[PDB]
Amino acid sequence: MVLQELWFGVIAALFLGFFILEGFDFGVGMLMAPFAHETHRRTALNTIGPVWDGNEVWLITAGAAIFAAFPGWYATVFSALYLPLLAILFGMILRAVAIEWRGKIDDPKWRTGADFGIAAGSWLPALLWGVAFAILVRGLPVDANGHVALSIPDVLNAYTLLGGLATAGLFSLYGAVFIALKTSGPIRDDAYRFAVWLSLPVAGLVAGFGLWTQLAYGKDWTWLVLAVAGCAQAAATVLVWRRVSDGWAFMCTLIVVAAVVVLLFGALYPNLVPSTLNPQWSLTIHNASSTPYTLKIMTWVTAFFAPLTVAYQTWTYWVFRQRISAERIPPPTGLAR
Amino acid sequence: MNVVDISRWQFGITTVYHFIFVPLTIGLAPLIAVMQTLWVVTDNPAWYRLTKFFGKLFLINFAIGVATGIVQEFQFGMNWSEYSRFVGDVFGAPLAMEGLAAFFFESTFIGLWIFGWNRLPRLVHLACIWIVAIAVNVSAFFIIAANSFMQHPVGAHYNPTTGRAELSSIVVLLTNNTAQAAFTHTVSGALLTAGTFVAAVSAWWLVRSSTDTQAMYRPATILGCWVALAATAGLLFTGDHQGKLMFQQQPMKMASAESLCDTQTDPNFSVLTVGRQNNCDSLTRVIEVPYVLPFLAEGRISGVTLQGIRDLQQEYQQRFGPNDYRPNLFVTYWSFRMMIGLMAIPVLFALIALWLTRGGQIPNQRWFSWLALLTMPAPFLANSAGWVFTEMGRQPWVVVPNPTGDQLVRLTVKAGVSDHSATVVATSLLMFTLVYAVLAVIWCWLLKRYIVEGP
Numbered sequence A: 001m002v003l004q005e006l007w008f009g010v011i012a013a014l015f016l017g018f019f020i021l022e023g024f025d026f027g028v029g030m031l032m033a034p035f036a037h038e039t040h041r042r043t044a045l046n047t048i049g050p051v052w053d054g055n056e057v058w059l060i061t062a063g064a065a066i067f068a069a070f071p072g073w074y075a076t077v078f079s080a081l082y083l084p085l086l087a088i089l090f091g092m093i094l095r096a097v098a099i100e101w102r103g104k105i106d107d108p109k110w111r112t113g114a115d116f117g118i119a120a121g122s123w124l125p126a127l128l129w130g131v132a133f134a135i136l137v138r139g140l141p142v143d144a145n146g147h148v149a150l151s152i153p154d155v156l157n158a159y160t161l162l163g164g165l166a167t168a169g170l171f172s173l174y175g176a177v178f179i180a181l182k183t184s185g186p187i188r189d190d191a192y193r194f195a196v197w198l199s200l201p202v203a204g205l206v207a208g209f210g211l212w213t214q215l216a217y218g219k220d221w222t223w224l225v226l227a228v229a230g231c232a233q234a235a236a237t238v239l240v241w242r243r244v245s246d247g248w249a250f251m252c253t254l255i256v257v258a259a260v261v262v263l264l265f266g267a268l269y270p271n272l273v274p275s276t277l278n279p280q281w282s283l284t285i286h287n288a289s290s291t292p293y294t295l296k297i298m299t300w301v302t303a304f305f306a307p308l309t310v311a312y313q314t315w316t317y318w319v320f321r322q323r324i325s326a327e328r329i330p331p332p333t334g335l336a337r
Numbered sequence B: 001m002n003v004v005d006i007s008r009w010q011f012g013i014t015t016v017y018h019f020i021f022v023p024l025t026i027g028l029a030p031l032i033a034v035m036q037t038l039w040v041v042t043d044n045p046a047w048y049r050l051t052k053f054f055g056k057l058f059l060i061n062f063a064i065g066v067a068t069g070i071v072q073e074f075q076f077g078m079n080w081s082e083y084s085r086f087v088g089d090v091f092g093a094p095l096a097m098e099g100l101a102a103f104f105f106e107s108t109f110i111g112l113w114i115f116g117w118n119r120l121p122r123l124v125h126l127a128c129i130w131i132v133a134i135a136v137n138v139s140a141f142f143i144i145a146a147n148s149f150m151q152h153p154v155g156a157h158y159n160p161t162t163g164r165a166e167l168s169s170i171v172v173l174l175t176n177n178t179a180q181a182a183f184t185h186t187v188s189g190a191l192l193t194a195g196t197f198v199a200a201v202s203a204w205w206l207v208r209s210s211t212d213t214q215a216m217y218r219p220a221t222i223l224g225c226w227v228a229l230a231a232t233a234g235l236l237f238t239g240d241h242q243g244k245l246m247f248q249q250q251p252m253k254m255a256s257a258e259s260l261c262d263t264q265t266d267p268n269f270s271v272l273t274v275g276r277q278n279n280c281d282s283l284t285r286v287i288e289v290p291y292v293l294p295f296l297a298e299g300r301i302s303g304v305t306l307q308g309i310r311d312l313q314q315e316y317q318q319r320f321g322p323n324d325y326r327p328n329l330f331v332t333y334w335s336f337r338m339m340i341g342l343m344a345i346p347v348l349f350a351l352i353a354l355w356l357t358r359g360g361q362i363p364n365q366r367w368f369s370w371l372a373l374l375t376m377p378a379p380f381l382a383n384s385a386g387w388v389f390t391e392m393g394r395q396p397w398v399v400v401p402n403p404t405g406d407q408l409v410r411l412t413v414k415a416g417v418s419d420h421s422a423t424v425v426a427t428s429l430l431m432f433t434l435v436y437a438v439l440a441v442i443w444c445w446l447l448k449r450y451i452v453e454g455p
């Protein structure tokens, strides 16, 4: 019914916001190591400093929304995909403590461990989430009883591995244009240097994964979404060679990330956990959803707090909209080891 | 061990690690807001340094508090898929509603408070820490109400058409008597953890300074001790509200804190009991203090009858079928002495610190400095023991049947577990334990480095 279909887009929007906001957060994390090849690492980290916690909650809200709206969907994907999600949590945990504790102790060995935690919390989520969403679009061996009995080839195949590399490459390009917009000076120039190198290889991964999803699982209306992604990617590709705009460059890359979420969720409709053995046993938005009263009660709460959440989250980015340079970085106030 | 036992330990060890930093975060956030508010009103630079000093320690605890809660959000679907489906229509609403009403606020405004000292106005920056101080309490309420549905399910029907419990009224679920009693008790428990933490650190510096900084840590010692004493009074009142609820909702758990075996009128509360407490028949009681269990069960010292564990064992078999409804007697018994006994150290420390700081006096005793250090872990361990008794006391019920509610709305831990293998859960349990253990050591070391360093 209506509420069942409406909440499918609300969960997709929560994952949409997670990919838009945490997408460049992951890109910053995997671009700190090539920046050195200390001041540049801190400048890039401070771009996502006051927003990394808020950005992350979108994944937490999306995960809890699924639990409340579609209890069967929550208890199937997170149960079947136990191993890929285990490494996602492992990285996230390290990044949640490495960002805050990096500047607590002034010691090169202390920061080396903190950089690993940030890298672990930015590489694994960038790679595995693309695989996790590719698995859902491809499907899972769900039987009539609801069990999955996941196997190795059902996770690491040609389609899922391409999706993981595409999202990780897109996030790296997403973080490259985000730093170039939030920084100025030599650090901004280095962001465009990697953006050019991450322009063509990433575009092929996104186009290849997008075309594969469209030709195998996409619908008729999803062709426009792929066309927008292609146009956005081509616009974003040419906006980095010549740095005419930072915002346009970031906005065009934002559309590419947004179009991937719509394309993945557009193909994952109305099925939530497609069954590769029998499509009748697949989990849909009708046989795995909650009652209308629960979806109704959650609708009023979502319609009040989700628009309110974007109100101050956007204002939070407006407060720290000023670009930060190497001269604006405060001296390291870390204790001796 | 089997899959169920390994999954029980994993959901236990990780979330116990989570409740090491949560009670400090809940109580300390209003405390720093108080110090920052006093700095704005009184224009006292002493309160500004207290805000920067204890605020620094809060951020170290806040970062690891977020990390330890990430797994718990998806842990329900990973290791308790069967349990997630049964109560997803009811249990998922408090978890999701806390995401947009408390998690989005306390995570977005915490960044504004850290990086907005010189960018945001003083009035606006002050409200940022107050929103975080409120959102942590809001998050505690919804996450406790969801757990209170397990302890006392209300506003839900079985709906035998499908094998899951379905929500009937959201108001009844949020206004549960167990939810309100446990929320106010945990918040009072969190205030004691932070109140003792502020008082102990400030009192530790008073002796160190004597052996202005003294001017600065003395007001914090007074504020921390009175908050701990106020939290102790709240813990007694809310603890008296909770025991009564426990009596009529979970008779097994009420007798679990006593290891009661037969239905006796006005039982004696035993401080100590020897043995592993397997069978319970041979238990030995030491220092039996009367007028305690009657007062906690029905609120009256005399005339209260409590059903024994043995008596309740056969009673539950006649309604829920043949099963082992006996919780872990050894764990629940000693985890209950622990929650209660661990009041003396914090309360004892608060009383002494206030006596040594009367009339502007600055303490300088060496034993007082050592007393504060040993007082710091007492509320942290007491909070851990309080929730452990709540979770091990309801075994083997993951969803305790409501005596006055729907009988069919219930589930066991074994029937709520997922269908993983013994090696997959063990690998996750092993990697969860070491990663949290390393971070816990770093978290403890980071606090020690900044406490001795000071401003």
Ligand SMILES: CC(C)=CCC/C(C)=C\CC/C(C)=C\CC/C(C)=C/CC/C(C)=C/CC/C(C)=C/CC/C(C)=C\CC/C(C)=C\CC/C(C)=C\CC1=C(C)C(=O)c2ccccc2C1=O
Pocket: B005, B008, B009, B010, B011, B012, B013, B016, B017, B020, B328, B330, B331, B333, B334, B335, B336, B337, B338, B339, B340, B341, B342, B344, B380, B381, B384, B385, B388, B392, B437, B440
């Ligand atoms: C005046 C005074 C001293 C009063 C208190 C002393 C007193 C009266 C009694 C306590 C002393 C005695 C004899 C026994 C202890 C009672 C007892 C067993 C209490 C419960 C244990 C408890 C609360 C432990 C606190 C843990 C804690 C905060 C440790 C420090 C923090 C750190 C760094 C690590 C701890 C996390 C860790 C590695 C393991 C956590 C394990 C714990 C505590 C709970 C989890 C857990 C337990 C305990 C099970 O028994 C169990 C059984 C079946 C399935 C699952 C589980 C399960 O998950």
Ligand code: HDD
Pocket: A053, A056, A057, A060, B015, B021, B022, B023, B025, B026, B062, B065, B066, B067, B069, B070, B072, B073, B074, B103, B106, B107, B135, B136, B137, B139, B140, B141, B143, B144, B186
């Ligand atoms: C009574 C308090 C309390 C209890 C019983 C719990 N939590 Fe918690 N949780 C907190 C109180 C809290 C908090 C105090 O509000 C924290 C700690 C620091 C923080 O940022 O929020 C937190 C953080 C926190 C976060 C980080 C969100 C963010 O800020 O980015 C998540 C995802 C969870 N929790 C989830 C859970 C789940 C799924 C629980 C049950 C299994 C749980 N918590 C038990």
Ligand code: HEB
Pocket: B007, B008, B009, B011, B012, B013, B015, B016, B018, B019, B080, B083, B143, B144, B146, B147, B384, B387, B388, B391, B392, B395, B397, B398, B413
């Ligand atoms: C969300 C809601 C919730 C919550 C809040 C919580 C909160 C908590 N918790 Fe919990 N749990 C749960 C839900 C929950 N929970 C469950 C469901 C389970 C399953 C059942 C069993 O296993 O028992 C558990 C289980 C559990 C355990 C194990 C036990 C056994 O098994 O025997 C433990 C130890 C714990 C602790 C804890 C704590 C400490 C806390 C504080 C933080 N836990």
Ligand code: HEB
Pocket: B181, B182, B183, B185, B186, B188, B189, B190, B192, B193, B235, B236, B239, B240, B242, B243, B244, B246, B253, B339, B340, B341, B342, B343, B379, B382, B383, B384, B385, B386, B387, B388, B389, B390, B391, B393
């Ligand atoms: C701060 C620390 C602490 C403390 C001190 C305390 C102190 C106390 N306490 Fe407590 N708890 C706690 C922490 C605590 N606590 C907790 C955490 C818990 C869990 C949650 C709830 O509320 O439930 C409890 C819970 C609880 C309860 C309920 C149980 C169930 O339900 O399961 C009761 C009855 C009580 C009583 C009491 C008392 C009487 C006292 C006096 C001694 N406790």
